[PDB]
Every structure is written in C-alpha cells, then in structure tokens.
C-alpha cells in the first residue's frame, strides 16, 4: 500500500524511532543490517535484509563471513566508545562487511574453511580503529573515509598472508605479461548488459547477476536516485573498460564496474547536491574511477593484491576536494547527508 511506501524508503527514521526503545539485541541486529546496507551509502535495514538475501544467493559461506565481520566491527566500535549515532547508522559495519566478504572471496581454500573466521574477526576488529584514525585526519576537510578502513585492512591482510601462506592462502594475482587476444566479433551484448547488475553486485564481491539485481532492488527501495546512479556508474565502467581494450571475460565479470558504481552514487546526490552539473561530475568521477581502477589493478597485481575499492575512495576524495565557483555544484556538510532526495530538499531549502 501507499503507507508502507513511506516507512520502507529512505533511512527509515520512523522504524528507527520505534526501535530506539526496545531490546538491545534487536537494536544490534538493526545496526548490523544498516551496516550491511551502508556499503552503497544506504542507511536502511530493509535494504540491508535484501542485500543479505543477495549475499545468501551468491554464496552462504561469503555471507557468513560478511555477517561475522559486520557483527565484530559493530562490537569493536561499541567497545572502543565510538559515537553511538554513527554505530546506530551502520557507519561502523560496512567496512567489516566488506572485509569479511573479500577475505572469503580471495581465499585459496575451499568454502566453509572455518579457520578463516579468526583472521576475519581480527581484521574486522581493526576497522573501527582505522575509521576513527582516518576520520581524525579527514575531519579537517569534511571528508568521509568511504571504504578506507576496509581497503587498508584487506590490503594489509592479503599482503601479510599472500598466496604462499600455509594457513590462509589467498588467490594468485599476477601482472599482465602478454597483449590480450581481443576478437571484437566474438562480442556478446547480452553479457555486456548483464554486466551492469553484475557490476553493481561486485561491490560486495558477488559475480552473480541475480545478487546484483537484488542489490539494485534494495538501492531502489531505499533511494531511486542511488539505484539510478549505481546503474549509470556500472555502465560507465563497462564503457571505459571497452575504451581501453579490455578482455571481454574481465568486463563480463563486473570487475570493471563496481568501483564506478560507488563513485557515481557518492558524487551524484549523496555528497553533492544533485543537479545536472553534479550528474555530469558524477559521470566524470565514474570514468576517472574506472581508469584509476585499471591503474591500481595493474599496479597492485605486481604485489599480488587485488585493487579492492582503492580507486573509488581516491577518486571520490579527489572530486569532493574539488573547489568550483559554480553555485550548482554544492557539497553538503557531512552532518546533513542522508540520501539524494533529502539532500536535494535540504539544498533547495538552504539556497532559497
């Protein structure tokens, strides 16, 4: 009905106010769901539930590791006396979600290698510390960290263990050593379009198109503008992949579009007031993220580490630090950032 279309969209402030006075177990589950959703800048528990459903569709071992990471990161943020409003908003759980997910994804062992849950825990514990340190650094420029605890922690882990580790071996990443055989006639446009939901789903490390579809559904039910910019960023990523002559097997996998999804979501509406100048700037940031992800992948394959989400964080920080005399390119303060619709409403209200 029309009544649920108000209590299920946005950040779900009504449900948050209703749950604020309940058992702390339910509040912790709500925080874990919001942290699951917050990977794509969504503070919605129902979106988090749908994202968890998608993770289960992809790989139940991966969602086990991700849930463990989120729980451990939220608990470490509680124990470290972090801001309760940030913990209740899932801002201390998405880095741990990604840590657990990508530590299960890049594990050379089989599924359900239960010994992997010790590094998952010990690395997800270090996400609140990195988040607080990087916030102490960035607070002088009103910048978010965006995934930098996760990137630092997972790069540290995948370099400490490496492929030739005895307990927790990682997958082998090697630099390119031969000009790829690219036959442009053997090109599947069905798979190219399928790489848009796969590109959205690769934000969590899931190469299944149905999980990407579920993620898109969650994005839409929280904020349609976030879903639109996610789709457009994935398209931009695919296009930039094609423009630099990339093997089609890498474009189909979505390994070229998940760093542009987050950049488009962040620039177009989330941390800039959404206008058409902001939309073009988001497209430019998605393109810059695609090319920077190419660079960082080719550069970190030498060390044997996957690119992670370094490209997204770096280029989004770059485009947030950009200063423009255009009054239509307006960067919202970090305290007034909820989602593109409310952001645009606040922008219009403070401008007029």
């Amino acid at each position: 009905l029309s009544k649920a279309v108000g209590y299920l969209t946005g950040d779900m402030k009504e449900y948050r106010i209703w749950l604020k006075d309940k058992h702390l177990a339910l509040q912790f589950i709500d925080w874990v769901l919001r942290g699951t959703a917050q990977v794509m800048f969504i503070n919605n528990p129902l979106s988090g539930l749908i994202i968890f459903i998608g993770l289960l569709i992809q790989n139940p071992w991966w969602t086990i590791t991700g849930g463990l990471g989120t729980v451990v990161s939220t608990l470490t943020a509680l124990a470290l006396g972090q801001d309760r409003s940030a913990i209740a908003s899932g801002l201390h759980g998405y880095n741990g979600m990604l840590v657990g997910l990508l530590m299960a994804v890049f594990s050379e062992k089989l599924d359900y290698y239960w010994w992997l849950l010790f590094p998952v825990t010990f690395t997800a514990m270090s996400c609140p510390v990195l988040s607080s340190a990087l916030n102490s650094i960035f607070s002088k420029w009103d910048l978010p960290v965006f995934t930098l605890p996760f990137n630092i922690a997972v790069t540290l882990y995948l370099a400490a263990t490496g492929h030739y580790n005895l307990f927790f071996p990682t997958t082998l990443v090697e630099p390119v050593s031969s000009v790829p055989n690219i036959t442009w006639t053997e090109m599947e446009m069905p798979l190219l379009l399928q790489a848009i939901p796969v590109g959205v789903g690769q934000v969590y490390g899931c190469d299944n198109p149905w999980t990407g579809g579920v993620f898109l559904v969650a994005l839409f039910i929280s904020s349609p503008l976030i879903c639109l910019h996610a789709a457009i960023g994935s398209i931009v990523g695919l296009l930039a992949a094609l423009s630099v002559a990339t093997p089609f097997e890498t474009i189909y996998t979505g390994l070229w579009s998940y760093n542009c999804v987050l950049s488009c979501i962040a620039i177009g509406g989330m941390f800039y007031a959404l206008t058409w100048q902001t939309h073009l700037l988001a497209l430019i940031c998605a393109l810059f993220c695609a090319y920077m992800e190419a660079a960082i992948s080719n550069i970190m394959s030498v060390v044997g580490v996957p690119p992670g989400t370094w490209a997204f964080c770096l280029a989004t920080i770059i485009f947030l630090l950009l200063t423009t005399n255009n009054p239509a390119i307006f960067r919202l303060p970090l305290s007034k950032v909820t989602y593109p619709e409310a952001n645009r409403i606040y922008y219009l209200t403070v401008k007029s």
Copy 2:
C-alpha cells in the same frame, strides 16, 4: 633595444595589461603560452613561445600532443569555474602540457598515432580536478602542487594502459637485474657537459641538446636567476648520478638531471627568498631530488612506470615544509611569488 628588455622579461605584466582588453581568443592563446612556460616556474608568453619552438625542434608530434593537452587543461579549468587569475597565469596549463608531452614520449606506437589524442584529452581534462583537490589539501600549509596533477594523471594512465595494452601500448620499463658494466676510462666529458642542457630539456621529455638550449634561453629571457639555478640543478643531478655509479648512457640522456632542475629553480629564489643560505638549500634539494629520483625510478620500474617528476615534487614539498630559525631562509607566501628577482625585492622591502 633597452625598451624591449623591460617588456620581454619577468612575467610581462605590461603586455598582460595590454592584452587584458582584447579578443578572448588572443587571451586564450596567451594563457596557453604562459601555461607552456609555467612548467619551469615562468609566467612569460615569450618564454612559452620559445619553449614551443624547442618542442617543435625536438618532435612536432610531441608538441602537437603537448599543445592539445595545454588547450584541453585550460578549457577544463574554464569550464570548472576555476580561479580566473590562476588560469590567466598559466597555472592550469603546465600540468596538461606535461601530460600530453609524456604521454606521447612513452607511447609504444609510432609518431602521429592520432588515436593517442583521445587519452591525451581525457587525461588533461583531469588535471584541473587534481590541481583543485591538491590545492584544497595544501592550502593549509601554503604549498604548491608543483606537478602533482601531472604526476598522478600520467602514472594513472601509464599503469592503466601499460606496455601490453591493445590500443595505447606504452614503452617497456623494467627493473635493474645486473650490475652495470661501468668503464670509467670510456668517459666523454663533452657529453657530460652536453647533459646540462639535455638535463634542462628533459623537464619536457626532450633529449635533444638544442631544445635544452632553447629552454635555457627562455629561462634567461624571463629570469636569469631561474636559468642559473636550472643549470646548477642539472649539474648537481649529473654529479649525483656519477656519485652513485650510474651507466654513462643514462647520464648523457639527461634522465638524471631534470628532477633537480625544477627543485633548484623552486627552492633557490622562487619559493624561498634568494640568499646564499637559500642557494645552499637549493643545491641540497637538487641533490636530494637526484637521489630520490634514483629511488623512485628503481621502485616504479617494478610496476613498469617511469619516475615522472615525483622526486621533484616530493623533495620540494619537503624543503618547503622545513622550518628554520635562520632569518635568511625565508619562505615567501604563495600570493607574493612571481620570480626570484621580484621575490628578493619584496623580501628586502618587507624585511627592512
């Protein structure tokens, strides 16, 4: 005559005031020339013309790519609402000049590979964004970026494409793997001295001695102190190359002196009030830049990327952040920095 020796030297403020009220096409050409000259801290359109002549002497394809990069960077700075006084001073064109130049230099394809003009444009467009982000960062310490948009953009491009790219392959850079055979009797001092103008010309990527001579001529006609410090920095680079046992073929090429030229120019008179303490500090910064360029070259050859001008930027930022109780080592504010002669005049006026 003596009259032109006033309207052709310095930043050419008289010609700038005369052109301020003319057709915007002429003003844009003036901005492009000033941006060409601003690579070596020179805000002079005639110096930019002489530098363009030198680029034509080296390789007309390289000057085509460089001119395209400068034009595209100035246009992107205009579209992004950047500061008009900084665009009119060429501060938004030298990074694009270097981007285009070094993207044509490190291209595996032949000359006039017209498809290279698309990455040149798309990478020169990203130089104003990087410049504005790094200025938002550095404004808290009164620091210039010095070439950091260019370094970031070109490293990103040369890592995204790489040697094994299908469309835009780059030259192969490999780390050292054997102790070089250095015969100190087969040593040409003529070529050693020729490596000083070649070292000045390698700032733009030109290994021809006549282009380096033309660059020196431009430096002198704008500011004789800049030309002197450029020559001394190139000498210091050559000496530091000899001191660490470098193959003579690399010293002759000037690949050891172009990162010390810029450092000496920046420290001795440009961003410090020129004294003898400042001169010694500039020599020390040139030596530090030579050794840091050795390090960064040996370190980035593993990733297959040339050192660029990372050494210069890093060591110059280091020597500008240096705090000294010596009243003779005075760092000018970024608003009062034009060229060493005017800088010293301002220093004397505000000190006395």
Copy 3:
C-alpha cells in the same frame, strides 16, 4: 646506592642541568648519547652508553656507522637552526643512528667498507630536513614522526642503490615464491624465548641476544615500564608470527618482534596515559604492527627493500589518531611526554 638510583633513572634532568654549563664538546657527546637512546623513547645518556656498548657487542663496524650517523644528524640539526631543546633531548639523533645502523646492516660489501661512510653521512644529513617537514605536517594533530625521517631516508637509499649497484650494493631481498615447509615438531622453545631479547635488539638491527639483553637493561634503568612494554611487544610479535604460519628461522631472528616493541613502548605509557585500557590498546597496537610488518615486508620485498620500521610508525600514528570516549584512554600532549612514570604522574595530577 639509593642516591644514584635517582640520578641514573628517568631522563636524568639533574645531570642535564649540571652539564648545561660545561664545554660544548661534552654537551654534544651528551646529545649523541641521548639520541642513541631515543630510538626506544628514552632520553637518558647512560641508557645511550649501554646501547652503544650493545652495538659494540654486536658489530663494531655497525656502531661506527651508527655513531657517525648520529653525529652527522645532530650537526645537521645544529646547522639548520633546529630547536635547541629538541637537539639537547636527542630528538635529532635517533633517526641518524638508525640510518647509519641499517645502512651498514643491509650492505652487500664486507665490514669496514669505509666508502659506505659517505652515503651514511649524506643520508643522515637528510634526517633533520625530513624530521622538520614531517613535524610541520604532524603538528596539526599533535603527532610524533617516530622514525619517519629514518624510514624515508633508508628506503630512498636502499632503492637508489639497490642490490645491483656498483659502489654500494645492498643485500638481496626477494618476495616469497613457495609455501614454506613448517615442521611444528622441530620447534625450539628455548629459541622462541631467546627471540624476545633478540626482538628488542632488532630495533637497532642487532640479532645477537646479548645486545638485546643490554638494550633491555638500558630500558629498565631508564624506565621499567618501557622495558616491560618492550618485552611484551616482542612476545606479541612472536605470537603473531606463529599465528600466521611463519618459518621458525624468521621468528628466531627477531625480524618479527622489533616493530611491535616500539609500538608497545609508544602506546602503553609513552604517548598515552598508562592505564589497563591503555595497556590493552598497546597490546592491540603491537599485534597490528606485527601483521602490518608482515604485509609491508611482503610488499616491499617486491621492490627489494626491507620493511624497516614502517609498520611501527604507521600503526602507532593510527592508534594515536584514534578518538575514544573512554576517559581512561588519554593521549598526553607532545610537550608533556617524558616517560611512562612521569606521564602517569602528570595524568593523575591534571585529572584530580
């Protein structure tokens, strides 16, 4: 007697006040001794003497290079007009001590290769500049550099020269390329416990257990809490080495515990008011430093450079930038940091 137990412990303020009015040669020797001791956060000349004795026990060539580095760094800090109170406190000599030490340790040539004293001097001269630049950066967050001049300088040197240099070749560092054969039955617990003093001694690059014992003695006679946290950090390093499946030959060498010693010393009492929360945070920082040192070692072996003390500096900066609502985790201002006992006394006095 009980009288010397007051004039030999702590920062030796009485002896400093007595020597303040003597020949500048004696004052310079005192500064060099304090700089030798300041590697492990100790401003004590007797501790510096004992550390020099330990360096002589390890390798007289290494202590020659270290002493030369300390002298050259203190002289360069004097010539660069640095703060006299920081030079008198050895804050400008420990980076040069480590530079000289680790440049002699990682030299492919034999002992007493007297030509190595030129790079030692020229690299120790660059430690005051790096220290002043990084202090100008960190002063906005009240952070110490902790060894960052040393890390930058020594990484720069070992990358500029490299293994295949003709004058100053360095030792060959190669990345791991095969899963290590780890026989847990062939495990020596005697050597495991011996790796605690060896882990403390590897802070200076000394793998001898007697030098580590001497270092522990110096730590204790200056501040027993510093010695305790050094031992605990070395233990934590050994444990984290065991937890990630490390070859026993690397654990015995102490190459896994010297980056946790400094982190534990820095967090537990030195730069945080020593409590039990601070002690647990120091253990966590030591564990994070062990894993980050694993990562940085595996990552910098690709470039052929040893990890140095990058892990310590980075993780300690991370844990100092951490902001906590816990009133018991209190970060002292940089001006009121002498040693854990005086730090705790000051904390109690300002809290009550």
